[PDB]
Each structure stands twice: as structure tokens, then as C-alpha cells.
Amino acid sequence: QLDGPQLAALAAVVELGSFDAAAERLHVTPSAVSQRIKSLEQQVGQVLVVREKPCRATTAGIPLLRLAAQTALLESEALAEMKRTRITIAVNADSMATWFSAVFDGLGDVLLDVRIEDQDHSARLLREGVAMGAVTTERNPVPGCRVHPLGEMRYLPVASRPFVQRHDGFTAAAAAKAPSLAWNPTHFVPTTEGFTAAARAGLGWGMFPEKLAASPLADGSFVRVCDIHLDVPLYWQCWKLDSPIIARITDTVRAAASGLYRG
Amino acid sequence: QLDGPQLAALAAVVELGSFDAAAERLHVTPSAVSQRIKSLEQQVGQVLVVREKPCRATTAGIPLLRLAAQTALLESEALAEMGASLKRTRITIAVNADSMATWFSAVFDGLGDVLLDVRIEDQDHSARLLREGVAMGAVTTERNPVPGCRVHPLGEMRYLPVASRPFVQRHLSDGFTAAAAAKAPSLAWNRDDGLQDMLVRKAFRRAITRPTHFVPTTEGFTAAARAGLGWGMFPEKLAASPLADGSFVRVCDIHLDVPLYWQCWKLDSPIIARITDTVRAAASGLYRGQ
Amino acid sequence: QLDGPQLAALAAVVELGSFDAAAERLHVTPSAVSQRIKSLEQQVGQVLVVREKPCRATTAGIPLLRLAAQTALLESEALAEMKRTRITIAVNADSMATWFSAVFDGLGDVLLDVRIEDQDHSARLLREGVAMGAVTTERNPVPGCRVHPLGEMRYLPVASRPFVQRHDGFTAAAAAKAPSLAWNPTHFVPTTEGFTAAARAGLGWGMFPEKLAASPLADGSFVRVCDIHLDVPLYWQCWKLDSPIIARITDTVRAAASGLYRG
Amino acid sequence: QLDGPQLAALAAVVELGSFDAAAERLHVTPSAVSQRIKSLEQQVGQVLVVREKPCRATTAGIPLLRLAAQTALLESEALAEMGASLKRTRITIAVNADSMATWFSAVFDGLGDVLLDVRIEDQDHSARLLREGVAMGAVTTERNPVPGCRVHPLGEMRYLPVASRPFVQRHLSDGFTAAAAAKAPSLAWNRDDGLQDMLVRKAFRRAITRPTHFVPTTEGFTAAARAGLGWGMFPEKLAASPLADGSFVRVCDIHLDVPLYWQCWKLDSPIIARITDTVRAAASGLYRGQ
Predict the structure, then answer these.
(1) Which of A125, B233, C156, C207 is deepest in the core (most CB within 10 A)?
(2) Which of B2, B44, B49 to mutate to test the interface with C (most CBs of C within 10 A)?
(3) Element (H or E) spanning D258, and its range?
(4) Which helix (H) or strand (E) holds C163?
């Protein structure tokens, strides 16, 4: 490889007729491009540019001007390949079920690729460069990622009115003597509309996001087992790169998470 | 010769991914587990377990995996027809996302006395869990009987192509043309989701590539649509409400009927038949179709 | 689990009317099945068979007869799933290109699944239980496999007449000063008809199986570089299970390899 | 900003699967390689390399992988248009199995002065190697231009459905009926081989499941057919001989024409154009088709 500051400097001094303008185009200095050029000529055993101003290419430097040109033509179309911008994001289920959807209001002008994943899989999607960022419970930066705290999600204990009197008071004896809902005397019932439907059906008691368990408790369809609550910090982790798109989304997500508890 | 606690060994070694693990799980030495799987590999003439890293079934070990589990259920019932009173049996069933959010919910209400393990899986994922004995039944879009399984029709689920009014204004002011449909953003659960594609085909006898968002889950897919991101196919039970609200509007007059089926272990089982009755009844509200 | 010798013994004493015949069907002994039965009844808290001959099942043993029955019905259809027999085999390229094809004469009555793989991939196919056996250069038994020596394949050095006088005599100085053919001053050219076509085209010199390099040397299209030869032992490795199908194929392959050199 | 020896870093880290390796390969510290890939990840705004176990390109790093290699060839030519005389350039090209056994062979005869690295790959495998800069050209059944690639038609290859006379006697005595074709064993290179399936379709406007052997490679597939295992589709150039021999006979009157294409790096290159001329001329013997 012979690239690449020395080439752009060569094309510059050749296309614009001067060392000054070259500088002007590369945000460098007249003397800084001069020796930038003399290097390149050194390592090819000939003189590429002719000092006389306006300075055009010497015959033996044409191919290198051609190189600079086709190189640059390639780079362009490459950058294109990699219209609507695609952003792939990972989110944990309770977040998609709860606060994350706000983000959709800010994002109708791009093309989302949303994945519902847990801590471990989010991390993989990050590392493997398929997910640009993840809502996750992991606090330690994933390789190549920056970590933004989002606050905490709060979970309550819940069952139905009937499930209470069946398993009196919270007879703290009925620890396992009570049937319990879960995700992955315990029934496993994913989604959200059924993990909810299970509990509503006096089928068990479970940990529900406060925000989800909100309405039914007011309806009276739900009752709190007890006044214990568990608090899980969420984090936005994304690629530690400076990019307008990464920043936009980090910002949208942080704002859709405003109503979470203080971390 | 015809098997035994040899299957037990297999199923344990695969579900637990270790020879040592499944040994301190059935009260026996690695050697025993090894000869047990070996003797079974001998009888059947096939290698059944990849021994490496985490232990998994080979292709040929899938059917005996299932065999082990149908046998385990058959066994615990034959020995409860002898003694129930209490018995809390573990039942695993696969269910497609769209069914769980709509009709399937009802199955819990009429359930007992059994411990439920429900998996949200698409057509392909669920057929695997059936083959592998992991699930003793599944709501699937699959009409063809998977191995070791009876097929029950449940009815058809109708899918309406919908979106919010703002979305229609911005993208379908002039209606659902093939010039408009090539530009309006569509939704989808993921790449394997063909629902939107069958419309468009049905609607334009063709196939139109468009901008398409991928948003999974009921809440996820629902917020996307509610948030005017794009149009998408929704189980009618789920659109019924936003159609009243004004929150959703039908993008066009066409729809999709998708036959559902309840596939479960072909065998005798008071627990199976009972679950089947419940699943079938929970679906009495589908469109009759066929 | 309660299975499974005790059940078959129960069904036996129940279906046939006697302990004798039971024995007769299970290749066991009258007294050996008697206590085989009393165990099973012990661990279910009731009497399953009635001593009186011919002995039928007791009411409380019917379900266990049913169990034995449905169990067995399942096993059958399972065994089926796992018409024409499918046999998947791995072979190294130079073997498929050379001696292995003889095997096809003995095998038109089954359905072959032939994979062309090297030592490492063969081994994986074996371990992962997809290939029943592999022709391979590996001598150490793969996990779960038995090893059959097959003999040695012999490779010669070759180029074209022109390639000689271009790279006098084997001026042992032109070690790298000569262009060479290879697989994975060296051109990489797989298949067999082209790895051959390359050399024929004075494009390089390479190691060819003696059997392949046979004809052209007689044609005069090929010449030997020198009289060095390299010898590679081949091995048939397959599942260490006793099975009629495994034995058939181990035998066919060993015979198709008869004309290899003494190992 | 616009890249540089940053690509060099990438391509090295991916082709070698290690940050340390590619460092002791370009004379620089891990850190340098790291910042170099980082600065490039920065400029482009994407993660480009999975750092783990063996280092591989991410999807978004594929195009820069190609970029690195087209640049590397462009560079070594621009600097040989300055100085050749000797130069032995490494060129990698993909070629489908059926082309290598028939017409492509000719390309070596009219070749120089260049070091050849030929890969036998099917349609899909070869398009990958083109995208990834691994191959600077490929004979493929793919008409659509892969990214960074010009497409040249080469002609069409004809495929005859054939078998040995013993095979016909035993299985096709009464000819190539859909009742006979459902029973006679067919061949195939593997599951993705659709050649035999397109016949049968062409022959019976339908699709018939049959016993089918899978035997890859030219010698492998050829011995199978010669050994009466089954019927299969053969490049005519290859059947021409056994049709004379009597060794093969056409199973039926139908055939398949498959358009071939030569896809190569879209750019200027005396080496590319030259290779292209040779490939194109080696194929002058295909059927003109189109």
C-alpha cells in the first residue's frame, strides 16, 4: 500500500494548480503538502509534480493521478451500499411492552429493525455489529460500546382477587404453597398479553412492571400480594462511535425513558 | 429388544447438555449413561448424541427424543389411573404470537389441574418442538401432520391490512395503488413474515418492494402501526378496537384468511384430549373457513 | 420411569397365559420372569398378575398392560421414521477421483449421500452423527468410531514436457524457481479435471495420484519430474456400532480399496 | 476524509482472524491496528469487525473488504504502469463445477503472466466471494450484477438428462413417464441442486418426488451415472463422449439451457480486461442462447 494522504495531496496539487489551494482543500498547510508530495515521489523513483505554478502532473505521475481518481470513485459507491437509513436496535421485552414505544413517534422517517432480546443476546447483536444499540439490563460496557444509564423499571407482586383467598392473608407459609407465573408450582407464560392473561385467570402470582400492573390494580382485576417491589436499572448501550445517527437514537431512547425512576 | 430407561438417558443427556450432569440426575455413573446411550445407539444402529461441548441430539436422535417424552407422559398417566387427587403435570405447548394475543388466552380459564409451559413460536419453530418431544401440542399454521402428531383444524384467522389515519393521509391519500404501495412504508414482524406480501400479491397480482419496518411482538407491532410508521396485517380481533377508536383505518378492502391447526401427540391421553378440547373451544370464535 | 424389562415381562405373562411361554418369548427363564413381575407389582402397591394358570391381568394391572401396548406402538413408528435406506458417507477428493467409485457397483439398491470432505470435516460429520463413515487420512479413532486401514495412495511429481525444459534437467537449484500446482510461484486449482488441466497447460508441476498420473505419462502428455514418491495411508472410519448396514459398507469400501498399496 | 491504510488494517484483520496477527503483518502495534480500524469505524459510522474468537467482517464491513482488494489491485497496476517485466500477480476467480470440467479449462492455456487461485463454487458461494473482494471475477449462473461488479454474458450451457443403458432397462423400459420418473432413482450434486427438478417440471408441468442419490464432483457424479445408480443432468460437452461409447443414453428428448455470466470487478484494469477476454473466448463454444 502507498496510500493515502500523499495521494490526495498529489491529486490536489495537480487538479488545483497550486500548493496553496491544495492546502485549502485538505485543511493543511502549504509547506506541509510540499514535503507530503516529495515523499510520494521518493518512494516511486520519479518526480510526479512540477514545481512551476500552476503545477500540472508530470507524465510519470499521470497513473498516480488515475489511481487517486479510480480509488475515490470506488470509495463513493462502497459507502453508498453500506434512501431510507436502516437502524437495527435490540430491546428487552418489558421495555417494548412499556416505555420504548414512545420512540416510534420520533422515528417515522427511517427504517427500524427491532429485535426483542435479553441481556446476553443484545450483547451478541452489539458485538457482531448488527445492532447499533440495545436497551439492556447489563451495566458493564460491551466491547466497542458506550453505556448510557436510563433509570430503573419497577416490578410489583400480583395475582387476582380470587387467587388471594385461595393462597389467610399472605400467609407467609404459602411461599411455594402458592402457584407462580414466570418467563424462562410455576407456569411459564411469555408474551405480555398472556403472561397477563394467565394471572388474570387466577393461574398464579407474578412480577409485573408497575406501569403494566397499573391499570388492573385500579380496575380491581389485580391486587398486590404485598408492598415489596424490585427495581431493575435499564441501560442504553450502543457503538462508541461519533455519528449523527447514533446520537439521534441515543437521544430519542433516553427521552422515551424519562419517566423511569431515578437511578 | 425395545428400549427402556435408555431413552431416559438420551433425553436427559440432551435436555441437560452433559453426560456427567444427566448422571447426577438419574443416579448412575457416567459409564452407565454412556453404555446406556451406546446400547441404544447399538439397538437403533445410529449415533444419537453429539458428545461435544453441549450435548445435542443428532437428526436421528430426534424421534427417540420425542419417544422418551411421550413415554414419560403415558407412564405418569397410567400410574395415576392406578393411584390423581393432587398431581400437577407439566405441559408444554407452542403457540403463534397472533393466537396468544387474541383467542388462545381463553385456554387458561378452563385449565387444570396442570402446570403450563407456553412458548411463542412461529410455524417452523413450533414444528421442531413437536418433533423433539419438547411440546406436546402446538397451534400452528401447518396443516401437514408433523411426525408423531394428530392434526385438528381450528378455523381460520382473518388479517386486515391497517394503519392509522395520519399514515393514510401522508402515504395513501389517493388510495392503495401499486404506485402508492411501492412508496408507503409497510410493517412486518421480520423477514420470514410473509403476511404483508400475500396482500399486495392478492391486491396487485404482482409483488411490490417497499420500505419496510421490522417490529416484533404484539405491543411492538401495535405501537408501530399506532405510531404511523407503516401499514401491516393485523388479526381482526386486534384491529376491531382501533377501528372503533378511529385509531386505525383499513388501508384497503382486501383481507387474508389463514387456516390454523391444533397439532398434538398422536396417542391416548386423558390430559391431551382435555387440553385439545379446551384449545378447540377457545377457537370457536375463529372464522369457520376450510 | 418404571420401564422396561418388568413391563415386557408383565405383558408377556398376561398375553401368553403362562410364565413358561413368557420366558420363551423374552429368551429368559420361568423363575427369572416370576420375580421380574413381583418387583413391578412391589413398586406400584398392588398385584398385577394372578398366579393361577392361565394367568390373566388383574384389574389393577390393566393400565400397565395398556402402557406396555401404547409404548410399543410408539417405538415402532419412531424406528420407522429414523423404503430405501439412506447412507451418508464422507470421502476425500483424491479417493472419489480414483478408487472410491467402484463402491457404486455394490450400492445401487440404497440411497447414497456422498460428501467430499477433508480430514477435519470428515471427523466433524462423524462426530455429529451425520456421516456413518468416512474415507480419511486420519489414523486415530474419531469419537465413537472404529478404524479400518485401507492402504496407501501414492503421489508422483509431474509437469508437462515443455514445463521441464522451461524449469537444465531437474536443476535442483530451481526449487522455487519453478511454478507449482496446489489445492489449498504456486497456483491453486481444485477439481481434478483442471488441477490436471493446469499442469497439462505447462502451468506448473504438482503432486498427482499415481493412478491419475498414469495415463498421461504413457500418453506422453505428462513427464515425471523425478522418481520421488509420497505415500498417504487412507482409512475407513465409521461408527463403532454393530449393524448390518455399517458392515456392508465397511466391507464394500475395504474392497474398492484392495488395489491400494500395502500399509 | 476518505480511508487509506485503514482498509489495509481491516482486510488484514479479517483475512487473518486476529488483531495481533495482522499487526505482525503490517509492522504496527495492536493499538495502531485498533485505532486504525476504529478511525475507519468512526469515519464510516459502523462497526466493521467482530472482535471475538476469529475476527470476521460484519455485514457492513463486507463492502470495505472489497474496497481494500480492488484498491490493492488498482495500486499494484498503477505502480507497474510506472515501472512490469516480471510481476506475478495473484488472481482469484470463482468457477461453477460444470464450467471447470468443460469449457473453462481453456483459460489456462491463454494465461499469463499471473498466479491463479481458482475456487469451485456454486452461484451463491461465488457471489459472496465477489462481494467480499475475495474473488476478482466469477463464472456464475447469476445474471444480476453483484455489488462492485460488471456482468458479461458468456452464452448458455446445455444439460441433457442421461443414464446408462442398464439403468434405462431396469427403470425406464417403458420410457420417461411420470409413473416411471416417480420410481426411477435420480441423481443430484446435493439438496440445492435444482437441475433435475427443472426437468420433470419441464417434462411433466408438475413435480415428482423420487428416490435421489447425492453425489458431488465431476468424477463422483459421473461414476454414479456410469454405474447405473440413477439419471441426472449433464453438461452436454461431458455426455458427448458416453453418448458415443454407448455408455450413456438420453432418458428423454427434453433439455435445459442455463445462461452463464462472467461477473468481475467493475473498474479499469489491464489484468481484469485481459482475464475477461480469455474467459469470454474460452466460452465461445457455449450455445449462443440469450
Answers:
(1) B233
(2) B2
(3) strand D256-265
(4) helix C161-166
Q: Are D233 and D223 contained in the same domain?
A: yes
Amino acid symbol at C261 = Y
* Nearest C-alpha neighbor of D184 from the set D195, D204, D168: D168
Query: Which grid cell is B13?
Result: 443427556
Domain boundary among C71, C91, C120: C71
Entry resolution in angstroms?
Answer: 2.7
Q: Does C32 touch chain B (CB under 8 A)?
A: no
On whether both C225 and C258 belong to a single domain, the answer is yes
Does C67 lie at the interface with B, CB-CB under 8 angstroms? yes
D207 with D153, same domain: the answer is yes
Query: Are B48 and B137 contained in the same domain?
Result: no
Query: Between A19-26 and A5-15, two packed helices, what is the crossing angle to 10 degrees?
Result: 130
C to D CB pairs, distance under 8 Å: 88
C143 contact B CB<8A: yes
CATH label of the domain that carries residue A66:
1.10.10.10
Which phi and psi (to 5°) does residue B244 adopt?
-80, -65
**Residue C60 per-residue DSSP state:** G
Say whether both D235 and D205 belong to one domain: yes
Q: How many CA atoms lie within 13 A of B88 on its CB side?
A: 10
Q: Which residues of D touch C203 (CB under 8 A)?
A: 108, 111, 116
Which of B150, B145, B159 is closest to B98 using CA atoms?
B159
Q: Kindly state the cell numbers that stand for D264.
A: 468481475
Residues of A with Cβ-Cβ distance to D72 under 8 angstroms: 1
Last-in-domain residue among C51, C71, C91:
C71
Angle between helices C19-26 and C30-42 (to 10 degrees): 100
Between CA D19 and CA D26, with CA D25 as vertex, the angle to 5 degrees is 95
Residues 6+ away with beta carbon under 8 Å from A209: A94, A97, A98, A153, A154, A155, A156
According to DSSP, residue A56 is labeled P
- D80-86, Cβ contacts within 8 angstroms, sequence gap of 24 or more: D81/A63, D81/D270, D82/A44, D82/A46, D82/A60, D82/A63, D82/A64, D84/D113, D86/D113
Q: Which of D34, D42, D59, D63 is closest to A243 using CA atoms?
A: D42
DSSP state of C56: P
C-alpha grid cell, residue B267:
396417542
Closest-CA residue in chain B for C66?
B78
Grid cell at residue A68: 487517486
- DSSP per residue, A175-203: SSSS-EEE---EEE--TTTTHHHHHHTTS
Q: Say whether both D97 and D63 belong to one domain.
A: no
- Give CA–CA dist D182/A50, Å, rounded: 78
Q: Which residue's C-alpha cell is 460429520?
A: C125
Place of cell 400480594: A225
B75: which residues sit within 8 A by CB, 6+ positions away? C1, C2, C3, C67, C71
Q: Total domain count for chain D?
A: 2
CATH label of the domain that carries residue A84: 3.40.190.290
Q: Is C202 left (phi over 0), alpha (psi -120 to 50) or beta?
A: left
What are the helix (H) ranges across chain A?
5-15, 19-26, 30-42, 62-81, 93-96, 119-127, 161-166, 195-200, 210-219, 244-256
Domain range enclosing D69: 1-83
Residue B212 · residue B225 · CB < 8 Å: no
Residues D133 and D249 occupy one common structural domain: yes
| Residue B74 shares a structural domain with residue B193 | no
Structure-block grid coordinates of residue A234 = 435499564
Indicate the DSSP class of residue B231.
B
D-chain residues near C108 (CB < 8 A): 185, 227-229
Cis previous bond, A54, omega within 30: yes
Bridge partners, residue C223, by sequence: C159
Instruction: Report how this structure was experimentally obtained.
Output: X-ray
Reading the block at residue D181, the C-alpha cell is 420418473
Does C148 touch chain D if contact means CB atoms closer than 8 Å?
no
